[PDB]
Subunit: 335 residues, 3 copies
């Protein structure tokens, strides 16, 4: 719990109402009860703010006239919401202290206040920084290093020789450092290319659940600082992702792709490899990226949904578009 006056101070918001109100948590506008602080971004929710039963509402100045409760005025309600939710976070830690069922190699190097959950497995030579938390059931492979403040939820797999920076967060089911998909071909038989590169993850990286990030073949797969990656993504060997880029759910990236800084890769996109995407590119969901992207801006692909009866005709016509083109050229020639 926190006093509304103290919360507004920490949030650099200006308070309009009883600063002695006690805030115990954050809630949506529709669910907020007494003690909750909430927020609004869309002006449509103005007309019925009197129906919201939160103790306080984070809003802008243009919103204040419509307020029907204590209000914290800020320039950016959504960012203030992020900050106040961190202050009022109820999320537990993946582990507390080192569990007696954890299996930790005697050559592991552990900092202070490291927590390791039940049945986690820590291999030889692993370095865990101060305040690192390893969840139940994780595996951390030989000589990997995890920087101070980083946290793995339950059942994360880190392979060997992996480097992870400070204050990262990796959700369950994710695998960092599996072999890249590298094979030579000897007369039709695949010949494995050992993948002896690594994965380097920077600081403040968040990776979702059941995402896979392969190690490089010789040099490294690199995730920049401040990158956020959603669930179900595949980051192939020797991919390089620039700082602060965001990758939404289910994105598949091929080997040796380079993505710049401040990019936004939409859900379920497919990005081919051995090419570069420049800074400040947005690919919208399901984008089929076949060529380098050299200019910033928003890019898209795909023919959207239609009723099935309509789609049948659309697809058949598109598949015969060469014949349509030939007929147009012939008609131009004749006219």
């Amino acid at each position: 719990s926190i006093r509304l006056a103290d919360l507004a101070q920490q949030l650099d918001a200006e308070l309009h109402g009883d600063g002695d109100i006690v805030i115990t948590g954050v809630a949506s506008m529709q669910s907020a009860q007494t003690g909750h602080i909430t927020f609004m971004v869309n002006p449509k929710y103005r007309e019925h703010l009197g129906l919201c039963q939160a103790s306080a509402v984070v809003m802008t100045q243009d919103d204040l006239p419509f307020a029907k409760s204590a209000a914290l005025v800020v320039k950016n309600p959504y960012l203030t919401y992020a900050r106040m939710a961190q202050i009022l976070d109820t999320t537990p830690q993946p582990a507390q202290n080192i569990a007696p069922s954890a299996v930790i190699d005697a050559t592991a190097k552990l900092g202070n206040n490291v927590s390791i959950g039940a049945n986690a497995v820590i291999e030889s030579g692993v370095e865990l920084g101060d305040n690192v938390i390893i969840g139940a059931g994780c595996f951390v492979g030989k000589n990997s290093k995890i920087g101070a403040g980083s946290r793995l939820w339950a059942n994360v797999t880190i392979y060997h020789e992996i480097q992870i920076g400070q204050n990262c967060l990796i959700q369950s089911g994710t695998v960092v450092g599996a072999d890249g998909f590298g094979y030579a071909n000897d007369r039709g038989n695949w010949v494995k290319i050992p993948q002896i590169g690594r994965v380097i993850i920077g600081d403040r990286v968040e990776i979702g659940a059941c995402t896979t990030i392969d190690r490089g073949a010789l040099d490294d797969t690199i995730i920049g600082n401040g990158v956020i990656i959603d669930n179900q993504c595949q980051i192939a060997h020797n991919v390089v992702i620039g700082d602060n880029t965001a990758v939404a759910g289910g994105v598949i990236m091929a080997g040796s792709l380079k993505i710049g800084r401040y990019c936004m890769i939409g859900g379920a996109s497919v990005i081919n490899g051995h090419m570069e995407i420049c800074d400040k590119v947005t690919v919208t969901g399901m984008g089929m990226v076949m060529r380098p992207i050299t200019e910033p801006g928003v890019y898209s692909s795909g023919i959207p949904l239609q009723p099935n009866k309509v789609w049948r005709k659309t697809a058949a016509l598109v598949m015969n578009i060469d014949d349509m083109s030939k007929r147009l050229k012939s008609l131009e020639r004749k006219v």
Copy 2:
């Protein structure tokens, strides 16, 4: 477990034609069935082939009966009868039996009657496991989560904190329920984490495949209705709502705050945008690119399917330049008129 044919026929509400004392030991395909096996025929084209099936009994319709070359179980719906008899004769093991000494179970967890927990599973404080719940080896169940009676998790399932799972659910290995939704605010180009303090509510009789991820909500909850079936490798984002009885095939990727109605069918590898609604009784065919709300029931499709590469090159180049083609058509139309 072996069963007399007459008893199996009674449990299936089938009409027995043949020796009720035949002992059935399992279910098999028509081509693999041997003595002791029961099988089924759904396709009357195989009537002439039944003499090649070595099953001790065959489930079939009344129209099929004159063609039988074995004891027959006559039913109205051979396919449904097959599902029922396979359940009766199921050889699938349980994920665990009893409580393994290597499992780590917080003292405050509440176990119902006849709960089984497999080797090296981890059960956090405040967890409640209903009667007959089975947790597979190596699972994690997070703080205060509740799993209803008869639900079963295979090995290596991850349930986060404050998750509610109904009765008689089944969750395959590698699945993660309740990870953080993809919630971040942007501050001058830096991403600022939004704690995801909502939950996941999973209803009764829900089946979830392997390596599927269902994220918790930001403030309110991600909700999966009763009787929903979800295949492998699906992504259900934070604050998605999936209505009762909907089926989601493999590899479907859903964005945040999507609401899918009841009785929908979402084909494999579809991609569904967020902050929008799909009404009841909608079918999206495979690889559907769902970018806008769907407000009428029925069948919807997208995608330009495969062609020989030489042909595809022309299709793709012409589509990409279709604006020029459209302009040329208009210009030719004006010249002719």
Copy 3:
């Protein structure tokens, strides 16, 4: 790990030019290579750059040799030689060594010689592990499953019951082999589970990436042939059959009862529908949408690639209205034909 250059050259069937007594400690990229490293050159545009490479030896072709600024191993196939020398000098650790005290192993399991089982792995009753099999930490191997000699599972792999895996396979972490196929009957709108009592049969020398799922069959079996390579995040549905030496890149989804032949190459993020067959020696390029059987070898493709969003908006609008474009074209043809 260290090996004299002359000995390495002999094991590679390479021709040594330079000091055979050089001690090679590992493999590196041309850009990263330092003393003790061996590297390779596949692209002759780097001949002028070899003086910037500080490897102790470089694998190259006879045509490259005049450009060398180091000991050289001359071979016909630098890329294949690299694969072989990377295997000889492999630094990849094993998933486990010996049998960990924290592993839980059913008394009825049968182990071959020199089996290793990692910490907190769980082995069910009736499992058979062949000689030199390695089971990583935290794995689960379900009842009666059999893993052939030399096969290795990395950490946190799940093998269900009644699964058969061949020799010298390799499965990366997070993968699930033998989960229930997506099988349901329907009773008045209620899904009725169909127990999936078939199996998965995986052949010899199969490599499977991370977080891939391969479901068991409904009655008969899901089958992966010998020498198949499957990348990460793939989905192989119940009763799929994949022929020998086929490669499947990352994120491919295959629906039930698909049959893929031998020597196929399935590009990343492709979607392959089921109850159909793809013949031998078919290449599906990335993101391919396969709706019909493929009966002739060769290369097949689908998809409309990326455009700037403002351009894409117009493209999508025109395509969605392509039927009207077709009707206008036919009408203009009748006019030009004087009808």
